[PDB]
Every structure is written in structure tokens, then in C-alpha cells.
Amino acid sequence: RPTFYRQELNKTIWEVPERYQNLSPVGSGAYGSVCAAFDTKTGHRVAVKKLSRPFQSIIHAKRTYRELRLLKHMKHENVIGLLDVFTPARSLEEFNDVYLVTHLMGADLNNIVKCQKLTDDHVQFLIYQILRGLKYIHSADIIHRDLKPSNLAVNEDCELKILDFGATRWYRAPEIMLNWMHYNQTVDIWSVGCIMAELLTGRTLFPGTDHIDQLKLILRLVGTPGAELLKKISSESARNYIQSLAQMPKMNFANVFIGANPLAVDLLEKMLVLDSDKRITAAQALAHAYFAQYHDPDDEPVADPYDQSFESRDLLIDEWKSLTYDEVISFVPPPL
């Protein structure tokens, strides 16, 4: 057990090990507050997140456990990883606060386009890394569900990490924006297509103002649902609404993205398919010719299987809290 020190910053008490120095508040909200800090053990800047009200209810206690289980499982170069998790508590009885430490990420994808025009090489590398992280995620039956440029961190070497597992609507697959059916892992592939289109053109692809406006913009590019997709939509009202729409053919993407790398446009056509069963998977997209400069099938690893059977458990607050405490205690830090 390290030595902790206690301080008040922005009327929040932070009690962290000595190794974390120069804490500066950089965010707050209902999920918790975040300080940037200097980790003297690794010599890196880190984000320290103090969870807010982690065990106030059953719902909160289970959400804390789910987040810690998820973050402890992710061990991949293009996915955010848990550098440390700690509590000042010496036992379960006084366990009330949970702190999570991750790499401090200097810029997101929105930030990097603000000060430079990305080359087609830059876009190949960025999208390749996103798909490489997603192949790992999806191989553990994890879905991100909220991929967007602000959840993608990029450094000065154009190296990328996927953050913050589940303007959000602009990157959402239509079957989950309107709750048409149970989510496929390829809802994340839809988001990658939206991000890639935006990086290639400098314009948001589907910037609708509400759900209906956005759905109409999507359907104008990809076509209205056919009978095979309509059969998969379980909500009867959703099916009746889609059938009320004037039919629209899919558009030729090459006529929408003139001047872009033709292999880029080809990959976009494979990601932005309306039927999620027909969208390209992350593993398949890594093999697409657009990424020929970067694809190495021996350097695109998969995850350990991830046991989500806890999700169907019905437990007391203090049982979720005890499970969380066990996961804090059993945490093994990554190698330096």
C-alpha cells in the first residue's frame, strides 16, 4: 500500500498515492471528476478519474463494477487501458471511493483536424488503427456503441486509441438511433464509416438536427430498407413508419466523393450498408486494399473471451460493492 495524501481541489476531496503529482482539474459531471496528473512511476502524464457516487444505488454499484471489469480486460495498443485503480480504503468496511488511472490523451480527432489538413496517408493510418482496435474489442463480444471523433485520442505520431466505452447521433447506426432491433457489433462499423467520410471531405456526413431529419439524410444515400431488412425490425410501428416512406434507391458513392482515393470510397460503401448483417466486419476491413501499406495479419491480435454473465445477476448494493472491491484488490498493473 502506497502513501496517500489528501487535498481539496474544486471542493472535491482527492486522496491519491504520492506517485501522482500536480493534479489539475480538467472535467466534472455525473460520471465523476477528472484531474490531469504526472505519474512519477512511469514518467507519463495521466488522467485520474474519481468516480462520483459509485455505490449510491444498485444501478450505480453495478455500473461501477461493469466499468472496472471492462477496463481491466482491455489490453491492446489501440484501446484505452487501465494503468492503475486504487482506493484509500484499508478494508471493505471503509471502501467508498474508486479512482481510475489512464494515459492522458492530448488531442482527440476533432482537435487534430482543427490545425492541419490530413493527407490520404494520415486517413489510412488513423482508420486502420480504429479497425485494429475494434477487431480486438469485437473479438471479446464487446461493442463500443458510441464511436465518434471525440472518443478517439491521437498523439503527435498519429497513433490512436479508442476511449470512453458506452453530435453522438451523427455517428450512430440507424437501427440503434431508432431502436429498430438488437445491436450488431457492426453498429461500430457504421460509425467508422461516418468518421472516415468526414476525415476525407472535411464535412460531417449525416448532420441531421433530430432523429427523423438524420434518418432521411441516411436513407437518401443508402436507400430505403428492402423487404429482407424490414423483416428484421421487431417494432411494428417502426416497420409501419418505414413502409410509409417514399422509396429511394441507393446512391452511387463515387458520384458523392469525387476526387477521393477510389479504394477509400469502396471501403465506405462496405461500411455504410443499411442492413447491419451485410456490413463489413473489422477483421474483414483490415484486409481491404485501402490498408495495404499497413495491414499485417500477424500483428492484429484478438482478445481473451470476456465473461459478461454478471450482467444477469441480481445483487444487493453491498454485493456489487464487494465484487468491485475484489476487482480493485486483484488488479495487476501493466509492465513498464
Partner: peptide, 7 residues
């Protein structure tokens, strides 16, 4: 790929 600028 090689380099990007900070915001």
C-alpha cells in the same frame, strides 16, 4: 503518418 501538430 509521420507527424501532427498540437491544437
Amino acid at each position: 503518418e509521420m507527424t501532427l501538430k498540437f491544437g
